[PDB]
């Protein structure tokens, strides 16, 4: 169960993500045409990069029982709701009692991943990911934060 996740990151977030998920050599372009070049997992050359510049990066999050999940919500068969941070699903002491497990997406939106004793397949997960936060209005805000740097 591997899920593509495309996001836009500032320079600090992009550098952090690149160093955590090792990149040997790659050039990342930004919203405003600035670029940063990683060579041998070390920053080498950066163009004129202003604040609020957005870089597009796609990361794969894979949801499996054995690997840890950053934030999930578990419902016992008795009716108790608990939340667990950064532990695998199998790491629960008594997985026998657990009925449902929902991933949490930092938007306070729950996506069902574990029901009826088995993981949710990829396509039902896509359906639930669309379905969880339908009426999510994002604030519209645009600032150019740049101008053609050279004298032309």
């Amino acid at each position: 169960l591997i899920i593509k996740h495309q996001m836009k990151l500032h320079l600090n977030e992009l550098v952090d993500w690149a160093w955590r998920n090792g990149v040997t050599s790659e050039k990342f372009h930004s919203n405003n045409g600035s670029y940063v070049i990683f060579d041998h997992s070390a920053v080498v050359e950066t163009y004129i990069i202003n604040k609020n510049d957005l870089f597009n990066v796609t990361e794969e999050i894979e949801i499996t029982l054995d690997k840890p999940i950053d934030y999930f919500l578990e419902k016992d068969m008795y009716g108790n709701y608990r939340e667990h941070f950064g532990i695998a699903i199998n790491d629960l002491l008594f997985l026998n009692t657990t009925v449902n497990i929902w991933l949490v997406n930092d938007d306070n939106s729950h996506i069902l991943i574990y029901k009826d004793g088995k993981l949710i397949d990829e396509y039902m997960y896509h359906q639930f990911e669309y379905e969880a936060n339908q009426n999510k209005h994002i604030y519209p805000n645009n600032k150019a934060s740049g101008t053609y740097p050279h004298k032309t």
Partner: protein, 55 residues
């Protein structure tokens, strides 16, 4: 790799997952596809390609 395939009046049917996937559901694992051609020239008419799992 530039092969040329001449297959007239032939049948390429059921080559894939068609026997299992659900009907009227666009979001499911479609696998397997008959008569795949990359960078190649094919000249075949009156064929019959029914019920392939994918393209």
């Amino acid at each position: 790799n530039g092969s040329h395939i001449q297959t007239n009046y032939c049948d390429f049917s059921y080559n894939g997952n068609r026997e299992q996937l659900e009907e009227y559901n666009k979001d499911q694992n479609m696998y397997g596809d008959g008569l795949r051609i990359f960078n190649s020239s094919l000249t075949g008419n009156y064929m019959t390609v029914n019920r392939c799992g994918e393209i």
